[PDB]
Amino acid sequence: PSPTPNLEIKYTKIFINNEWQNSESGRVFPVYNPATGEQVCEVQEADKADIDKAVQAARLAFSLGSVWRRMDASERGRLLDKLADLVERDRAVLATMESLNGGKPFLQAFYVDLQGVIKTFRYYAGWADKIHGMTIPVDGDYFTFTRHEPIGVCGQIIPWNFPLLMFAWKIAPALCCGNTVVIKPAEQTPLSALYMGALIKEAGFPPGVINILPGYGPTAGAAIASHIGIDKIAFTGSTEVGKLIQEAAGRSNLKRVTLELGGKSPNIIFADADLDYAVEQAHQGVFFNQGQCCTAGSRIFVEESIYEEFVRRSVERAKRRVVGSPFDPTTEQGPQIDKKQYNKILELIQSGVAEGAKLECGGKGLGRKGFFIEPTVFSNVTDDMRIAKEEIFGPVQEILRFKTMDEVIERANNSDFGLVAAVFTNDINKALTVSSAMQAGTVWINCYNALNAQSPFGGFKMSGNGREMGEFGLREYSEVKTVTVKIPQKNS
Amino acid sequence: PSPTPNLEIKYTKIFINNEWQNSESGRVFPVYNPATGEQVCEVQEADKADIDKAVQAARLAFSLGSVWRRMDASERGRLLDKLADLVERDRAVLATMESLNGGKPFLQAFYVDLQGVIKTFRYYAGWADKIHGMTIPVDGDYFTFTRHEPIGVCGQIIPWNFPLLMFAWKIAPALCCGNTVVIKPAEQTPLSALYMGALIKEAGFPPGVINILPGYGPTAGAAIASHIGIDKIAFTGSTEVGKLIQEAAGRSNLKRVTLELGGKSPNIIFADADLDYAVEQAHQGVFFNQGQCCTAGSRIFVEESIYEEFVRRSVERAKRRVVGSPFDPTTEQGPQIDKKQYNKILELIQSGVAEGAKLECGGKGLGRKGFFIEPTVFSNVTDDMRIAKEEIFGPVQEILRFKTMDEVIERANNSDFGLVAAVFTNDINKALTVSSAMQAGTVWINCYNALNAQSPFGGFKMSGNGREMGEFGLREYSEVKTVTVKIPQKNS
Amino acid sequence: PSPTPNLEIKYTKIFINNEWQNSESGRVFPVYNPATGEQVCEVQEADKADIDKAVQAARLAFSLGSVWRRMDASERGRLLDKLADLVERDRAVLATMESLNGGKPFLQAFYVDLQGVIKTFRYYAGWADKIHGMTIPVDGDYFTFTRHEPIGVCGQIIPWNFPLLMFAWKIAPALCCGNTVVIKPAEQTPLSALYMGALIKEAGFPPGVINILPGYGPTAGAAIASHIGIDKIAFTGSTEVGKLIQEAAGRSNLKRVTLELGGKSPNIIFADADLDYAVEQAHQGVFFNQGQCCTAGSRIFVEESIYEEFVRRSVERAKRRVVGSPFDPTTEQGPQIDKKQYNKILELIQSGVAEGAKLECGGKGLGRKGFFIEPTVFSNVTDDMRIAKEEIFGPVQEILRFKTMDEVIERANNSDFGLVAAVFTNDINKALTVSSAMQAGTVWINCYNALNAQSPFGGFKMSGNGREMGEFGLREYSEVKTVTVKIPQKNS
Amino acid sequence: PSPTPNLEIKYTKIFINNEWQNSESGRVFPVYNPATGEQVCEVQEADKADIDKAVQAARLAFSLGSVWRRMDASERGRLLDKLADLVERDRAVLATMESLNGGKPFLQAFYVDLQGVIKTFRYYAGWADKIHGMTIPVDGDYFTFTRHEPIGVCGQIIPWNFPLLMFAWKIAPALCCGNTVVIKPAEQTPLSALYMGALIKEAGFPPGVINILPGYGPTAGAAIASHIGIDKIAFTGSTEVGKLIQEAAGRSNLKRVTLELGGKSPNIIFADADLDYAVEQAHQGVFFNQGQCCTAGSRIFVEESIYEEFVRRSVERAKRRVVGSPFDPTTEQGPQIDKKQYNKILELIQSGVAEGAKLECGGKGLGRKGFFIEPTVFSNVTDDMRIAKEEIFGPVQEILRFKTMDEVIERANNSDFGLVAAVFTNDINKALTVSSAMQAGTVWINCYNALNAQSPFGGFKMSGNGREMGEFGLREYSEVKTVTVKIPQKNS
Ligand SMILES: NC(=O)c1ccc[n+]([C@@H]2O[C@H](COP(=O)([O-])OP(=O)(O)OC[C@H]3O[C@@H](n4cnc5c(N)ncnc54)[C@H](O)[C@@H]3O)[C@@H](O)[C@H]2O)c1
Ligand SMILES: *[C@H](Cl)C(=O)NCCCCCCCCNC(=O)C(Cl)Cl
CATH of the domain at D386: 3.40.309.10
Chain D environment of A136 (Cβ under 8 Å): 132
Is residue A345 in contact with ligand 1, taking CB distance under 6 Å?
no
In terms of DSSP H, where are the helices of B333-404?
339-354
The minimum-distance atom of ligand 1 relative to the CA of A344 is: 41
Could you tell me which chains touch chain C, where touching means 3 or more CB pairs under 8 A? A, B, D
Question: Could you give the number of structural domains in chain C?
Answer: 2
Chain B nearest-CA residue for A485: B445
Instruction: Determine which one of D45, D98, D154, D260 is catalytic.
Output: D260
Residues C65 and C190 in one domain: yes
Alpha-carbon distance D47 to D45, whole Å? 7
Contact A249 B244 (CB under 8 A): no
The helix/strand/coil state of D288 is helix
The helix/strand/coil state of D393 is coil
What does the DSSP 8-state code read for residue C337? Answer: S
Domain CATH for B64 = 3.40.605.10
Is residue C116 in contact with ligand 2, taking CB distance under 6 Å?
yes
Residues C92 and C238 in one domain: yes
Q: Atom 8 (ligand 2): residue with closest C-alpha?
A: C293
Closest by CA to C480, choosing from D456, D226, D257, is D456
Alpha-carbon distance C190 to C187, whole Å? 6
One-letter amino acid at D283 equals H
Distance from CA of A145 to the nearest CA of B (A): 8
Q: In Å, what is the CA distance from B134 to each residue of A121, A471, B225, B483, D467?
A: 22, 10, 33, 10, 18
- The H helix count followed by the E strand count for chain B is 15, 20
Residues D203 and D340 in one domain: no
Chain D nearest-CA residue for C488: D446
| Most ligand 2 atoms within 8 A of CB, residue of C117, C121, C165 to mutate | C165
Residues C312 and C451 in one domain: yes
| Cross-strand bridge partners of residue B303 | B402
Query: Which residues form the domain of D32?
Result: 14-262+467-478
Residues C370 and C405 in one domain: yes
| Most ligand 2 atoms within 8 A of CB, residue of C118, C167, C451 to mutate | C451
The separation between the first and the last C-alpha atoms of chain B, rounded to the nearest angstrom, is 61
Residues D274 and D258 in one domain: no
The minimum-distance atom of ligand 1 relative to the CA of A248 is: 32
Chain B environment of C79 (Cβ under 8 Å): none
Is residue C294 in contact with ligand 2, taking CB distance under 6 Å?
yes
> Sign of the CA dihedral D213, D215, D216, D222?
negative
Chain C nearest-CA residue for B149: C492
User: Please, which residues 82-111 of chain B have a Cβ atom closer than 8 Å to chain C?
Assistant: none
Is residue A463 in contact with ligand 1, taking CB distance under 6 Å?
no
Contact B491 C64 (CB under 8 A): yes
Residues D170 and D271 in one domain: no
How many A from CA of C297 to the centre of ligand 2?
14
Measure CB to CB from residue D178 to each of A136, A445, A492 and give the nearest one: A492
Q: Give phi and psi for C457, each to the nearest 5.
A: -145, 135
Among A74, A82, A119, A176, the strongest candidate for a mutation testing the C interface, having the largest count of C CBs within 10 A, is: A74
Alpha-carbon distance D173 to D180, whole Å? 11
Chain D environment of B118 (Cβ under 8 Å): none
The answer to whether position D490 is within a domain reads no
Chain B environment of C445 (Cβ under 8 Å): 428
Pairing state between β C376-379 and C358-361:
antiparallel
One-letter amino acid at D481 equals K
Residues D256 and D349 in one domain: no
How many A from CA of A371 to the centre of ligand 1?
18
In chain C, how long is the greatest CA-to-CA distance? Answer: 81
Cβ proximity of B469 and B453 under 8 Å: yes
Chain D nearest-CA residue for A425: D428
Cβ proximity of C43 and C194 under 8 Å: yes
- Which strands make up the sheet holding A180-184, listed edge to edge? A19-21, A14-16, A210-212, A180-184, A153-157, A232-236, A256-260, A464-465
Residues D432 and D291 in one domain: yes
Which class for D329: exposed (0-12), middle (13-18), buried (19 or more C-beta within 10 A)? exposed
Q: Judge whether D53 is annotated as a binding position.
A: no
Contact D139 C452 (CB under 8 A): yes
Told to judge if C260 belongs to the known catalytic residues of this protein, a careful annotator would answer yes
Q: Judge whether C186 is annotated as a binding position.
A: yes
Whether D481 contacts chain C with CB within 8 A: yes
Q: In Å, what is the CA distance from B452 to each residue of A136, B89, B123, C40, D168?
A: 10, 22, 10, 63, 29
Contacts of C431 (CB under 8 A, 6+ apart): B428, C423, C425, C445, C446, D485
The answer to whether position D82 is within a domain reads yes
Contact D145 A149 (CB under 8 A): no
The answer to whether position D7 is within a domain reads no
For helices A91-102 and A73-89, the axis angle rounded to 10 degrees is 70
The answer to whether position C140 is within a domain reads yes
Residues C225 and C148 in one domain: yes
Catalytic residues of A: 260, 294
How many A from CA of C34 to the centre of ligand 1?
70
Residues D221 and D297 in one domain: no
Cβ proximity of B195 and B11 under 8 Å: yes
The answer to whether position D111 is within a domain reads yes
Chain A environment of C75 (Cβ under 8 Å): none
Instruction: Determine which one of B260, B374, B398, B476 is catalytic.
Output: B260
Q: Would you put residue B408 in left (φ > 0), alpha (ψ -120 to 50) or beta?
A: alpha
Element (H, E) at C202: helix C191-203
Cβ proximity of D106 and D247 under 8 Å: no
The answer to whether position C488 is within a domain reads no
Pairing state between β C19-21 and C14-16:
antiparallel
> What burial letters (b/e) apply to D76-107, b meaning 16+ CB within 10 Å?
bbbbbbbbbebbeebbbbbbbbbbbbbbbbbb
Annotated binding-site members of B for NAD(+): 158-160, 184-187, 238-240, 340-344, 391
DSSP characters for B76-108? HHHHHHHHHHHHHHTHHHHHHHHHHHH---HHH
Contact C467 D457 (CB under 8 A): no
Whether B133 contacts chain A with CB within 8 A: no
Alpha-carbon distance B195 to B201, whole Å? 10
Closest by CA to D258, choosing from C257, C439, C248, is C257
Cβ proximity of A491 and C433 under 8 Å: no
Element (H, E) at D433: helix D428-437
Could you tell me which chains touch chain B, where touching means 3 or more CB pairs under 8 A? A, C, D
What does the DSSP 8-state code read for residue C322? Answer: P
The answer to whether position D30 is within a domain reads yes
Closest by CA to B78, choosing from B204, B217, B252, B221, is B204
Alpha-carbon distance D277 to D275, whole Å? 5
Query: Within a 10 A sphere around the Cβ of A261, how many other Cβ atoms?
Result: 26
Q: Atom 28 (ligand 1): residue with closest C-alpha?
A: A217
Residues D197 and D152 in one domain: yes
The minimum-distance atom of ligand 1 relative to the CA of A187 is: 37
Cβ proximity of C317 and C283 under 8 Å: yes
Q: Would you put residue D216 in left (φ > 0), alpha (ψ -120 to 50) or beta?
A: beta
> Sign of the CA dihedral A164, A166, A172, A177?
negative
The answer to whether position C221 is within a domain reads yes
How many A from CA of A219 to the centre of ligand 1?
13
Annotated binding-site members of B: 158-160, 184-187, 238-240, 340-344, 391
How many A from CA of D427 to the centre of ligand 1?
42
Told to judge if B41 belongs to the known catalytic residues of this protein, a careful annotator would answer no
Chain C environment of A437 (Cβ under 8 Å): 491
Whether C123 contacts chain A with CB within 8 A: yes
One-letter amino acid at A18 equals N
How many A from CA of B491 to the centre of ligand 2?
33
**Ligand whose nearest atom lies closest to the CA of A249:** 1
One-letter amino acid at C256 equals R
Cβ proximity of A119 and A81 under 8 Å: no
Instruction: Determine which one of C260, C360, C374, C476 is catalytic.
Output: C260
In terms of DSSP H, where are the helices of A331-373?
339-354
Among C179, C241, C455, C460, the strongest candidate for a mutation testing the D interface, having the largest count of D CBs within 10 A, is: C455
